[PDB]
């Protein structure tokens, strides 16, 4: 409906660990905003099935985090593979943003892009090569006027959709708090 090459694709992944060569994607979510950060549509929220041997690579931090959130139980119950998750996500995105136009948007989104390169290259290809990393702005604010950061709080639940929603809210806060455009 509001299909435009100015729209922004927001994405978050949850993984069994930090190393793309070793670990696996267990959840994915996407959100599309317009260029002014108004949320236009939320994409598929997909817990991706992984066998126990892949879940068994998780360290204590990932095990407790993803178990307490209910994600591990959703992963075990899920019947959706990476390729099906890719198919679902691309069928969503093609309705809102053309291929190759939106930078990848999120918090420390470079780490997610590594997992996309390795495990979902067809989806990585959908993004423009640039990055919109909200944590870049967080870091500069911490150094230039850290007191600003006390006016914003994150829950940080590691549920992919809630975490992207918090990323958009964080950038919305910065536009009023540290930007003048
Ligand atoms: Na993340």
Catalytic residue among 117, 129, 131, 174: 129
Using CB atoms within 10 Å of the CB of residue 155, give its burial: 0 to 12 exposed, 13 to 18 middle, 19+ buried.
exposed
Please give the distance, rounded to the nearest whole angstrom, from the Cα atom of residue 176 to the centre of ligand 1: 23
Give the count of beta carbons closer than 10 Å to the beta carbon of residue 76: 13
Q: How far apart are CA 108 and CA 106, in angstroms?
A: 6
Q: How far apart are CA 118 and CA 24, in angstroms?
A: 10
- Give φ, ψ of 132 to 5 degrees: -115, 100
Both structure tokens of 75: 């992963």
Provide the CATH number for the domain formed by 1-181 in this structure: 3.30.420.10
Q: How far apart are CA 34 and CA 81, in angstroms?
A: 29
Q: How far apart are CA 172 and CA 151, in angstroms?
A: 13
Method: X-ray
Q: How far apart are CA 13 and CA 146, in angstroms?
A: 28
Please give the distance, rounded to the nearest whole angstrom, from the Cα atom of residue 53 to the centre of ligand 1: 23
Please give the distance, rounded to the nearest whole angstrom, from the Cα atom of residue 111 to the centre of ligand 1: 8
Q: How far apart are CA 33 and CA 41, in angstroms?
A: 7
Q: How far apart are CA 147 and CA 54, in angstroms?
A: 42
Give the count of beta carbons closer than 10 Å to the beta carbon of residue 5: 12
Query: Is 129 one of the annotated active-site residues of the chain?
Result: yes
């Amino acid at each position: 409906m509001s299909f435009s090459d100015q729209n922004l694709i927001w994405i978050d992944l949850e993984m069994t660990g930090l190393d793309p060569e070793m670990h696996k994607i267990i959840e994915m979510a996407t959100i599309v905003t317009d260029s002014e950060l108004n949320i236009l549509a939320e994409g598929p929220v997909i817990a991706i099935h992984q066998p126990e041997s892949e879940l068994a690579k998780m360290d204590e931090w990932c095990t407790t985090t993803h178990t307490a959130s209910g994600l591990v139980a959703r992963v075990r119950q899920s019947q959706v593979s990476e390729e099906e998750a890719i198919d679902q996500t691309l069928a969503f995105l093609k309705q809102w943003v053309p291929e190759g136009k939106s930078p990848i948007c999120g918090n420390s989104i470079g780490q997610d892009r590594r997992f996309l390169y390795k495990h979902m290259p067809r989806l990585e290809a959908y993004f423009h090569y640039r990055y919109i990393d909200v944590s870049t702005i967080k870091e500069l604010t911490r150094r230039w006027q850290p007191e600003v950061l006390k006016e914003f709080s994150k829950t940080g639940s590691h549920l992919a959709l809630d975490d992207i929603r918090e990323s958009i809210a964080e950038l919305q806060f910065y536009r009023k708090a540290v930007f003048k455009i």
